[PDB]
């Protein structure tokens, strides 16, 4: 369980993945990016999550490089995640895109590689490419992002390997109860993209009350709540003080009452794109 920054979940194939990691986001590239990734690693993060649609894997690659050397660790102590973008879903296309991603990140293998979206008519051939790459020992774990129950059901009529991760929007106003249950029952590990959702709750009175009783920020208590729900969490940030502070989530625990107070905030409000109704 979620006792320290370098605590790991075990995926269904035995792979240890950090409960807590750094989300990379549409930044920029170079100076600020590179420093954010380095800063997080040196501080003690051991999971970095990116996507090719970013367009910043080269920045991530260098940030990993200097992170590694200044922390005095190995590439192998880190857990790196990338994703195939929609435009690149398909068998050969996805094989090619994985190689592209590996080059830019400066890596010989990924720890986890995800399908970014359930693009109807393309994601099954994409999955087959993930399975091949998995079977070849090129990726430690393989999974999926933004899949609904019915997408996972449909995937598993023809899949030889079951997804190990389902990386999803998840926060107090979108608590995803049915999907989380379904996934836990399948052995598919939940991960939250954008757990803090651009700071959207950071004035909420329930959460401000809870934050205050613990002498924590709202962000800190949200992130702890992700963790006590058993969901892997990857908050985005580029600001050093923020990167450090978001990880300070292990000096306390939320009671079952605090957890029910935050769960009660569910509104079924999706802030990101609808997995059943998207066009990109
Ligand atoms: Ca492209
Ligand atoms: Ca975030």
From Swiss-Prot:
Keyword Chaperone appears in the UniProt entry: no
Site feature Lowers pKa of active site Tyr, where: 83
Domain of life: Bacteria
UniProt: NADP(+) binding residues: 194-246
Annotated binding of substrate, by residue: 116
Alphabetical list of SUPFAM superfamilies matching this protein: NAD(P)-linked oxidoreductase
UniProt-recorded Gene Ontology molecular function terms: aldo-keto reductase (NADPH) activity
Alphabetized UniProt keyword annotations: NADP, Oxidoreductase
Keyword Oxidoreductase attributed: yes
Matches recorded under InterPro entries: AKR (IPR020471), AKR5G (IPR044500), Aldo/ket_reductase_CS (IPR018170), NADP_OxRdtase_dom (IPR023210), NADP_OxRdtase_dom_sf (IPR036812)
Catalytic residues, chain numbering: 54 (proton donor)
The enzyme's E.C. designation: 1.-.-.-
Family affiliation: Belongs to the aldo/keto reductase family.
Protein's UniProt name: Uncharacterized oxidoreductase YtbE
Species annotation: Bacillus subtilis (strain 168)
């Amino acid at each position: 369980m979620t006792t320290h920054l370098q605590a790991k979940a075990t995926l269904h194939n035995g792979v240890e993945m950090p409960w807590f990691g750094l989300g990379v986001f549409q930044v920029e590239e170079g100076s600020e990016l590179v420093n954010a990734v380095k800063t997080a690693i040196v501080h003690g993060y051991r999971s970095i999550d990116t996507a090719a649609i970013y367009g910043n894997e080269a920045g991530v690659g260098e940030g990993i490089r200097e992170g590694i050397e200044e922390a005095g660790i190995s590439r192998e102590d880190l857990f790196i995640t990338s994703k195939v973008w929609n435009a690149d879903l398909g068998y050969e296309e996805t094989l090619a895109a994985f190689e592209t991603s590996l080059s830019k990140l400066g890596l010989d293998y990924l720890d986890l590689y995800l399908i970014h979206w359930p693009v109807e008519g393309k994601y099954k051939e994409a999955w087959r490419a993930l399975e091949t790459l998995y079977k070849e020992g090129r990726i430690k774990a393989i999974g999926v992002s933004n899949f609904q129950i019915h997408h996972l059901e449909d995937l598993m009529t023809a899949a030889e390997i079951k997804p190990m991760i389902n990386q999803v929007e998840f926060h107090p106003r979108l608590t995803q109860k049915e999907l989380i249950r379904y996934c836990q029952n399948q052995g598919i590990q939940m991960e939250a993209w954008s757990p803090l959702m651009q700071g959207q709750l950071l004035d909420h009175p329930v959460l401000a009350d809870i934050a205050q009783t613990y002498n924590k920020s709202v962000a800190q208590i949200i992130l702890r709540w992700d963790l006590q729900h058993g969901i892997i969490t990857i908050p985005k940030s580029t600001k050093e003080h923020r990167i450090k502070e978001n990880a300070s989530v292990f000096d306390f625990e939320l009671t079952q009452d605090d957890m029910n107070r935050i769960d009660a905030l569910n509104e079924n409000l999706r802030v990101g794109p609808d997995p059943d109704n998207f066009d990109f």
